[PDB]
Amino acid sequence: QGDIVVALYPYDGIHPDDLSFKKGEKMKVLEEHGEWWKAKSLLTKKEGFIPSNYVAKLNT
Amino acid sequence: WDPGMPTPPLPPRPANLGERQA
């Protein structure tokens, strides 16, 4: 369903809905499409689209 | 080291994926 990923670099909140995340930050994926998955910021429940490049899976 | 501030380019967003809602 929703896997957990960690940001390797800050995203860049440019869109009004994009979820901003920083490097080393942990995020929860809810629906990974094919290039931009919408994760949730553990900071305080932030939900926004995250790029499939900045963040990486907890594994590799 | 020296810099300490990396950041790869993001994806393109299929049909405004990470852009707007749908």
Side-chain angles (χ1 to χ4, degrees):
Chain A
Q1 258 237 17
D3 253 281
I4 203 112
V5 279
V6 61
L8 285 164
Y9 321 97
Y11 160 59
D12 176 13
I14 25 161
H15 278 246
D17 242 43
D18 273 333
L19 160 280
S20 88
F21 57 69
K22 305 269 141 74
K23 59 106 220 297
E25 263 227 82
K26 46 255 204 46
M27 276 104 51
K28 196 143 84 262
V29 205
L30 295 150
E31 211 107 339
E32 166 248 333
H33 287 263
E35 324 284 5
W36 287 80
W37 333 324
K38 226 233 227 114
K40 211 192 177 130
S41 212
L42 287 101
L43 198 89
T44 170
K45 317 225 286 159
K46 240 223 199 77
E47 59 232 42
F49 269 91
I50 55 146
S52 54
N53 132 68
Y54 277 141
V55 315
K57 310 137 63 109
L58 177 66
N59 293 292
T60 180
Chain B
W1 69 83
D2 226 335
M5 39 256 233
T7 10
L10 351 87
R13 297 182 198 226
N16 292 258
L17 180 57
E19 286 214 357
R20 282 101 165 318
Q21 285 174 243

